């Protein structure tokens, strides 16, 4: 029959076959279930889509064409769930959130 | 000269799907590549531990769902679980 990618069957953009291969060759289990690569590819795609949409919103708010690392850092650090997920992660060319303690501000 | 096999094209497809007009730089592309690799490693390792604890030899979608619940905080886990369940249901119907 005609070849059909598993990503197309699951309706995803991320590669289900590549994820399956990485799971099999990654020393994680003796066997890998059929739906596990689909599930984890869907999860990865969802996380990527959420971060990219937030970064694109940040870039548009700065009236910029392209997402640069600063926009990714702004998207993650301004979301508490994303900050908790990436608490111990350093982003290259990311900078820091603009925050000044109220005590340092003059009267 | 060994076909580095990154995640760039899929992230770009997702970006063009969710923001049809904005682009992305090479540095941000590499950062998102690293992010996908890191989250893959975290979820896969935690699912491997889950299978080991219960004396199972195979990683199933149940293991991945539990790993997602244990690793993602708040509504992130809920929405990721919904996405994974919907994808697996669609794939089962072929």
């Amino acid at each position: 029959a005609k070849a059909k990618s598993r990503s197309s069957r699951a309706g995803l953009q991320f590669p289900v076959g590549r994820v399956h291969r990485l799971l099999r060759k990654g020393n994680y289990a003796e066997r890998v279930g059929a739906g596990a690569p689909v599930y984890m590819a869907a999860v990865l795609e969802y996380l990527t889509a959420e971060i990219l949409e937030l970064a694109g919103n940040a870039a548009r708010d700065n009236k910029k064409c392209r997402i640069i690392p600063r926009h990714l850092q702004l998207a993650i650090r301004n979301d508490e769930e994303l900050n908790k997920l990436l608490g111990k992660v350093t982003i290259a060319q990311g900078g820091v959130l603009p925050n000044i303690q109220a005590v340092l501000l003059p009267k | 000269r060994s076909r580095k096999e990154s995640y760039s094209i899929y992230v770009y497809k997702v970006l063009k799907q969710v923001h049809p007009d904005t682009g992305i730089s090479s540095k941000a592309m590499g950062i998102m590549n690293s992010f996908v690799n890191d989250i893959f490693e975290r979820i896969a390792g935690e699912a491997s531990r889950l299978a080991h604890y219960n004396k199972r030899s195979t990683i199933t979608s149940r293991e991945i769902q539990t790993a997602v619940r244990l690793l993602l905080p708040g509504e992130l886990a809920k929405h990721a679980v919904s996405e994974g369940t919907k994808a697996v249901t669609k794939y089962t119907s072929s």
Partner: single-chain antibody, 226 residues
């Protein structure tokens, strides 16, 4: 478990300012933005703005800037909205609703509503009102002005009550809603279907979009049972 408490009705003369609380409990306070919605009988529901207690970030409706200011009190898990220069055209019920920072999420839980009285994307809900018996099919359409990538939610509001969420992300069932309710559609046309009706299901149904910065409700739909 999740509760958003509000204050009682306010009797305020024109020209002054009033502040109402949205004391919240039952969840991690800093993880969810608190959105404020006003409801007038002649313009339905209008989105005022939101506050993110994690970083005190705000975003107001362009038609409400200056008139309303939102403050976050992290210690008491309370959010206040301050309305200044109360004009005669401010007599309305003000709702405070919880919405997660995730783009897919919506205003899931609502406060009881603080009745204050003083002494762009357009949503089109095509069927204004309908009558049906205890077992038929009913469909409500929420044709949109621009496109929204399934960032549409369906709410049910019983009279003199806070709106209740039914569908979020245009297809996903809310928490605890029976599978009789079903939403569908994407892009600019969205639909809500009720499987089998009961005497309870008589209410007003609104469609909220949050795909763009000013959130806009639908015109409303009064459903009558038998």
């Amino acid at each position: 478990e999740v509760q958003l408490q509000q204050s009682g009705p306010e009797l305020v003369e024109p020209g002054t300012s009033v502040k109402m609380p949205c004391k919240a409990s039952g969840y991690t306070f800093t993880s969810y933005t608190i959105q404020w919605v006003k409801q007038t009988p002649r313009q339905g529901l209008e989105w005022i703005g939101y506050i993110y207690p994690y970083n005190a970030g705000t975003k107001y409706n362009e038609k409400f800037k200056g008139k309303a200011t939102l403050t976050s009190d992290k210690s008491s898990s309370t959010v206040y909205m301050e309305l200044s220069s109360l004009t005669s055209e401010d007599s309305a019920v003000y709702y405070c609703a919880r919405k997660s920072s995730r783009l897919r999420s919506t205003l899931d839980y609502w406060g009881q509503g603080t009745s204050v009285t003083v002494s762009d994307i357009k949503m089109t809900q095509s069927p204004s009102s309908m009558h049906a018996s205890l077992g038929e099919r009913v469909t409500i359409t929420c044709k949109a002005s621009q496109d929204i990538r399934s960032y549409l939610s369906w709410y049910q509001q019983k009279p003199w009550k806070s709106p209740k969420t039914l569908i979020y992300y245009a297809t996903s069932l809310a928490d605890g809603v029976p599978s009789r309710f079903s939403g569908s559609g994407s892009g600019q046309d969205f639909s809500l279907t009720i499987n089998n009706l009961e005497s309870d299901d008589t209410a007003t149904y609104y469609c909220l979009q949050h795909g763009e910065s000013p959130y806009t409700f639908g015109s409303g739909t009064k459903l009558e049972i038998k």
